[PDB]
Amino acid sequence: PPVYRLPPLPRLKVKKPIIRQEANKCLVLMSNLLQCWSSYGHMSPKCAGLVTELKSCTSESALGKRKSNINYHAARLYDRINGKPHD
Amino acid sequence: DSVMRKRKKKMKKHKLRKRRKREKAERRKLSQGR
Amino acid sequence: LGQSTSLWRSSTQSYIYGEYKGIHIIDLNQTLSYLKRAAKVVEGVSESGGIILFLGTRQGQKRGLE
Amino acid sequence: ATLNQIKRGSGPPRRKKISTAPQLDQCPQRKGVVLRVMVLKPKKPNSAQRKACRVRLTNGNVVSAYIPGEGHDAQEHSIVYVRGGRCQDLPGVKYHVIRGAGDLSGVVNRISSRSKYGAKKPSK
Amino acid sequence: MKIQTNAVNVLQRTSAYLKSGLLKETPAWYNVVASIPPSTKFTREPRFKNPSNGHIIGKLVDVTEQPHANNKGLYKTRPNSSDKRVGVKRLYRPPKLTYVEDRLRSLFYKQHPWELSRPKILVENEIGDENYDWSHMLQIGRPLDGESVIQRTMYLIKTKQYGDMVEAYDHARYEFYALRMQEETEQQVALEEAEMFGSLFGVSAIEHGIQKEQEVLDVWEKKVVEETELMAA
Amino acid sequence: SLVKLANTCAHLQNCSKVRVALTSIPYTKLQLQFAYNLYQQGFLSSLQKGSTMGPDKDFVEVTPDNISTRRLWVGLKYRDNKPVLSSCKLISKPNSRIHLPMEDMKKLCSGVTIRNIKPLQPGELILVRAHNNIMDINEAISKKLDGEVLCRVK
RNA sequence: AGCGUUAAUCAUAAUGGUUUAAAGGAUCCGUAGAAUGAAUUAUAUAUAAUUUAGAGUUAAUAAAAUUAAUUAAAGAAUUAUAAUAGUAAAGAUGAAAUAAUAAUAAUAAUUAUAAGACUAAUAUAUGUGAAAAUAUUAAUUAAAUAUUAACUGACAUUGAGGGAUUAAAACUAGAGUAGCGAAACGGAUUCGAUACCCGUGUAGUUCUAGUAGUAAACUAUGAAUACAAUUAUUUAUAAUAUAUAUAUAAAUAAUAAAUGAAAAUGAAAGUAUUCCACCUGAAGAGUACGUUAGCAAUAAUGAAACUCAAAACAAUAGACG
RNA sequence: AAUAUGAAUUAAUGCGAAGUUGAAAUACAGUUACCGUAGGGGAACCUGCGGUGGGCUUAUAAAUAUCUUAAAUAUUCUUACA
Numbered sequence A: 001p002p003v004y005r006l007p008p009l010p011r012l013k014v015k016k017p018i019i020r021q022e023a024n025k026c027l028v029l030m031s032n033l034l035q036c037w038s039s040y041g042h043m044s045p046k047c048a049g050l051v052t053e054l055k056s057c058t059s060e061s062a063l064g065k066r067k068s069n070i071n072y073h074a075a076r077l078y079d080r081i082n083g084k085p086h087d
Numbered sequence B: 001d002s003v004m005r006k007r008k009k010k011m012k013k014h015k016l017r018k019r020r021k022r023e024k025a026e027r028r029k030l031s032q033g034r
Numbered sequence C: 001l002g003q004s005t006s007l008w009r010s011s012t013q014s015y016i017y018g019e020y021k022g023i024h025i026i027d028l029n030q031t032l033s034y035l036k037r038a039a040k041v042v043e044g045v046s047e048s049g050g051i052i053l054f055l056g057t058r059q060g061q062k063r064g065l066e
Numbered sequence D: 001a002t003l004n005q006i007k008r009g010s011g012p013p014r015r016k017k018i019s020t021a022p023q024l025d026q027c028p029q030r031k032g033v034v035l036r037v038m039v040l041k042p043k044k045p046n047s048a049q050r051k052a053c054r055v056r057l058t059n060g061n062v063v064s065a066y067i068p069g070e071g072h073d074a075q076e077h078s079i080v081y082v083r084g085g086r087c088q089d090l091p092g093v094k095y096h097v098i099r100g101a102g103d104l105s106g107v108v109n110r111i112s113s114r115s116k117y118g119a120k121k122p123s124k
Numbered sequence E: 001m002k003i004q005t006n007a008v009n010v011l012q013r014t015s016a017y018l019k020s021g022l023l024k025e026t027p028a029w030y031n032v033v034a035s036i037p038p039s040t041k042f043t044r045e046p047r048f049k050n051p052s053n054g055h056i057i058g059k060l061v062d063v064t065e066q067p068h069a070n071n072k073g074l075y076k077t078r079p080n081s082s083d084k085r086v087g088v089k090r091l092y093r094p095p096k097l098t099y100v101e102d103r104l105r106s107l108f109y110k111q112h113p114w115e116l117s118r119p120k121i122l123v124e125n126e127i128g129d130e131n132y133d134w135s136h137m138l139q140i141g142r143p144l145d146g147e148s149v150i151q152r153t154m155y156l157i158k159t160k161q162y163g164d165m166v167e168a169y170d171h172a173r174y175e176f177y178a179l180r181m182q183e184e185t186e187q188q189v190a191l192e193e194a195e196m197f198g199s200l201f202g203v204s205a206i207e208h209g210i211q212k213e214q215e216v217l218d219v220w221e222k223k224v225v226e227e228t229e230l231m232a233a
Numbered sequence F: 001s002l003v004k005l006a007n008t009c010a011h012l013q014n015c016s017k018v019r020v021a022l023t024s025i026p027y028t029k030l031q032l033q034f035a036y037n038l039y040q041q042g043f044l045s046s047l048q049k050g051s052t053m054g055p056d057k058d059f060v061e062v063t064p065d066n067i068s069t070r071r072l073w074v075g076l077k078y079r080d081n082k083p084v085l086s087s088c089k090l091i092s093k094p095n096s097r098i099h100l101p102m103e104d105m106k107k108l109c110s111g112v113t114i115r116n117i118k119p120l121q122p123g124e125l126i127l128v129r130a131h132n133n134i135m136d137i138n139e140a141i142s143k144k145l146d147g148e149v150l151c152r153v154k
Numbered sequence G: 001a002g003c004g005u006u007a008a009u010c011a012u013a014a015u016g017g018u019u020u021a022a023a024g025g026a027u028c029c030g031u032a033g034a035a036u037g038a039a040u041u042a043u044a045u046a047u048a049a050u051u052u053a054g055a056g057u058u059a060a061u062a063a064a065a066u067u068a069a070u071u072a073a074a075g076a077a078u079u080a081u082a083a084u085a086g087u088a089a090a091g092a093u094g095a096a097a098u099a100a101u102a103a104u105a106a107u108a109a110u111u112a113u114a115a116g117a118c119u120a121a122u123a124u125a126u127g128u129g130a131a132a133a134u135a136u137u138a139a140u141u142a143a144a145u146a147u148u149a150a151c152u153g154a155c156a157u158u159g160a161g162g163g164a165u166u167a168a169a170a171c172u173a174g175a176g177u178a179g180c181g182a183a184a185c186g187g188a189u190u191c192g193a194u195a196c197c198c199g200u201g202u203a204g205u206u207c208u209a210g211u212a213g214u215a216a217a218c219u220a221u222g223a224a225u226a227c228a229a230u231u232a233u234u235u236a237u238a239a240u241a242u243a244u245a246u247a248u249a250a251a252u253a254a255u256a257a258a259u260g261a262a263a264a265u266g267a268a269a270g271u272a273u274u275c276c277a278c279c280u281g282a283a284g285a286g287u288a289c290g291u292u293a294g295c296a297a298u299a300a301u302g303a304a305a306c307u308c309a310a311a312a313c314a315a316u317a318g319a320c321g
Numbered sequence H: 001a002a003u004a005u006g007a008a009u010u011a012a013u014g015c016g017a018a019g020u021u022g023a024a025a026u027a028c029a030g031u032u033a034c035c036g037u038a039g040g041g042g043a044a045c046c047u048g049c050g051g052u053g054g055g056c057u058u059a060u061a062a063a064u065a066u067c068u069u070a071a072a073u074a075u076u077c078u079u080a081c082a
């Protein structure tokens, strides 16, 4: 296969350490409720428990719950892992 | 030439072109019949 | 067992015996002679009462160094 | 810079002189007649009022000559001798009127550097 | 990296200091270094033999040295393109060490994959101390493996009992097999004996394996349930 | 030829720079003579005929069958982390070839710049061709040979 | 017994340079060269006879389908016209308007004709070409790689003058003209807006035959030869016992050394040799005058006076956006 | 015929003086800047066409990893053992 060797870089590091955390539960519930209220008119009792669940979630604060360290291993091992020729 | 230095040359060339445009009728008069 | 074929400082060419298993192999008669020479100078400074300093930054080396 | 190129005209550039005073015509002084006598504004940024003059030399060509010293006696026709100095702050004047000789008189009450101007020795 | 003058010319630099009077007292090492001089001759030295094979590096086969006709029946009357190129880099680049035994090793483990599963200690005991007569396979310090076979093959080749290499290899293989079978029988019968005389083994190998699998499965199950729940939501 | 000589000099310099031990040169008469002169003065450790691939152990006669593949192998020389043959500047270049009489050579030897040659140095060797035979400039003076000032090694 | 000053002469850096500071010709071809250029021996730098290592010639065997010129095809769309049914907006922009937009029935949609001009992916301009250039398909003619075999026997290198090709714009004819689009006109924007945005859109862009010979024609790096330390990538060649690990070359990417004002160059910006081009402070100036060439625009050639002690590059640390 | 000097009027250019009109360039300089060329504009300039970088190489993750005697054995060992 085609290998791709980089040039000498200043610092191997992920550009942005997106953590990729899970979406909020309260937001999901709110979206579900919105979807339900699309159908079934304005406020029918099919979404009677969903609204209650949303209220329970968003009682203390609007959202329920409130970093990736990959730099350390890349930073550490860049100089080793290089195919940089000798001094 | 850097770009800054080139810009003086460019300006000179433009001025020359302008002069030539101005002195077209005069040049024509000078050229024909002498 | 020398470093590797791709991690070669050609400055060290005289010392190496040949390559095998994708690895330069150090001429060991040469190694022996240099070791003896080194050993003799180590002995000499110890005899003269000199300060010998053993420097070894790698992981496992500490105890033997001490 | 190849050997052949050098042979057919190439080498280090040589400069002798471009003559500081061309209008003087390869000689120490020339006599001239003053035409007008001015007061020039110097170049930036040093400022004064420089007592220059315009002089038609004997060879024919006309020249802007500086007049040194405190006091200058020069009319619109005075006999004046020009030498090849240069007034550095005034642009376009590359000459000095030599001051002891001609209708240009020696600078008055000069004690230091008297030969540089016209000044005679006071003689006690 | 440039060849450093200042690492090996130490005594000269100090001798100068001593001469000057910059140094009042001589170092401890000074006399010792004078007695035992450094190399200071950091050359690229050429090599003319491959040590493993014994091939000649430097020489060139001439047109006069090849009188007879070539493959495709053409007589060499001129030097070729490669015979004119100055092959100096071959003298200096270190030789690729080749052994006939490597090919035999490769063959053996192709023929016997499960010989790879027999663990191999690579940490050498005194290489000088050993003294193996390859008349037979079973040496004392050495275990029974493909290596021993190969050594036996080489011995046979040397002695010319089997002139052909392949036949010698086969013979060595057949010697090995009998020994392996004997080893296999030994362990089984020892196990049988142990069973007979009331020996008690707490964890058998298969039981151990099952236990090992069980923990992994338990780990998987909890994770898998969580994943299914996530998928549902 | 003189271009060849310059090329071999350049090659020698290159080899001195990187510290190779044993170096090939083209197999010509002038070149061989030059190499022999260097050896005798003490710049080369070894001098031996051989193939394009390496120096020859035994004698091999050179013919039209070999000649294209033939080569002159030469051992370089180092001492106390310094190469012996530092330089190989030639004097008579192909375009401006210079031919001195004996007096001019004497003057050069005794510290006089001649025909824009820096006069010869303490541990230097100016080689001189005289009737297709390369010599030291001092040797040429002694024998009294008006010759081409070939090259300069230090 | 002169000292000043002016006017002059000699010395005071080429023991130089041209990627980025002045300075590589747009590119090749090739004449002269009083330029340079292999091997061995023998004659008294040359002649002579021998060599094949440079440079060629012709085969054979592998590969490759590229670059020219010419001829013949293909394709998505675009605009225009017409029909169908269908309904009030459409198109545009930062937001708006003006317009061959639309209640004369559009726009969108579906069809159906025509016209030009372009060539999605593959694509890396990888590669190929002397350089300009060059990627839809096919054919024709031309030229092209490597290794072997044989032959020629230095026939070579570079190349002033010269010659040929040379993007875009421009020009002269004759076709062509969908889209784009200098100019022009109109609408916006703006204090103003001879602009940036939008709309009509003529030259032009297209072809055929020419003229012209310039571009940041750039790798801002002339051509050739010999040589020098490593690694990784591909590509091709040979052997290996077709798929392995090996030997070669070739290119590309990191470097060592070396060079360098440094940035950095890295088989050249290194070590050397040869040949050609070109530079010698900045302004004035690639201007004027003159000459040659062109249908012309213009192209080449190319001064001086006047005026300054400036002017320029690499890198450094800030401030600033 | 060539050369030199003069010429009403007229053009370029230099130096000084820092006035007016804009704000073209340097940062993404507020439309990337410049080369060639053509057309237009009080003036810098604007616009078309191809070229160039002396502007964007300024380039920096879709994440999960394994079984053999855990010790009366390894871990201790100071020229001993063999």
Ligand SMILES: [Mg+2]
Pocket (backbone or CB within 6 Å): B001
């Ligand atoms: Mg320049």
Ligand SMILES: [Mg+2]
Pocket (backbone or CB within 6 Å): D113, D116
């Ligand atoms: Mg004074």
Ligand SMILES: [Mg+2]
Pocket (backbone or CB within 6 Å): D111, D112, D113, D114, D115
């Ligand atoms: Mg006095």
Ligand SMILES: [Mg+2]
Pocket (backbone or CB within 6 Å): none
């Ligand atoms: Mg000089």
Ligand SMILES: [Mg+2]
Pocket (backbone or CB within 6 Å): none
């Ligand atoms: Mg330079």
Ligand SMILES: [Mg+2]
Pocket (backbone or CB within 6 Å): G024
């Ligand atoms: Mg060029």
Ligand SMILES: [Mg+2]
Pocket (backbone or CB within 6 Å): none
């Ligand atoms: Mg140029």
Ligand SMILES: [Mg+2]
Pocket (backbone or CB within 6 Å): none
């Ligand atoms: Mg070229």
Ligand SMILES: [Mg+2]
Pocket (backbone or CB within 6 Å): none
């Ligand atoms: Mg395409």
Ligand SMILES: [Mg+2]
Pocket (backbone or CB within 6 Å): G159
């Ligand atoms: Mg040529």
Ligand SMILES: [Mg+2]
Pocket (backbone or CB within 6 Å): G167
């Ligand atoms: Mg183009």
Ligand SMILES: [Mg+2]
Pocket (backbone or CB within 6 Å): none
């Ligand atoms: Mg055109």
Ligand SMILES: [Mg+2]
Pocket (backbone or CB within 6 Å): none
């Ligand atoms: Mg036309």
Ligand SMILES: [Mg+2]
Pocket (backbone or CB within 6 Å): none
């Ligand atoms: Mg428009």
Ligand SMILES: [Mg+2]
Pocket (backbone or CB within 6 Å): none
């Ligand atoms: Mg033409």
Ligand SMILES: [Mg+2]
Pocket (backbone or CB within 6 Å): G214
């Ligand atoms: Mg032009």
